[PDB]
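[retry 2/3] semliki forest virus capsid protein: previous attempt timed out, resubmitting with same input.
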Amino acid sequence: CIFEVKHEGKVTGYACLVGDKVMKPAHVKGVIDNADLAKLAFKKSSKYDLECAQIPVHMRSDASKYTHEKPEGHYNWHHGAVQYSGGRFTIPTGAGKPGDSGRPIFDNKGRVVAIVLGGANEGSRTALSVVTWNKDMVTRVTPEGSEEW
Ligand SMILES: [Hg+2]
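[retry 2/3] semliki forest virus capsid protein: success.
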């Protein structure tokens, strides 16, 4: 489900197969390091800093489901455990760096809950700037002073 965006042979961010679309942050330079995915036609959306396309039938079995359901508590992500509360995802400052955009924040059942775009450093912890699903529609939460990863 996770695929890496490469630029001049260097990993810039990530791309993710969520729902029936193929996502990757718009700000990420490079092209998805996967033939099938790279040749697709993406629809940019500067409001959401998102850039989606549709998953080829032969990879649709490889998508990851999403969900609007996110109760205060701890979520899972590649570098550890994210914490959700007050309508804000955070992590121990230092555990997320530039080049982590595109990485999904899963819950304990595997449902992708948000997609990291960058983070604002507010001391001990960094409030993440993510793309998250609302009632049905996509949304983007960007804490004051975010540094786009
Ligand atoms: Hg994914």
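[retry 2/3] semliki forest virus capsid protein: The helical segments are 35-38.
[retry 2/3] clearing retry counter.
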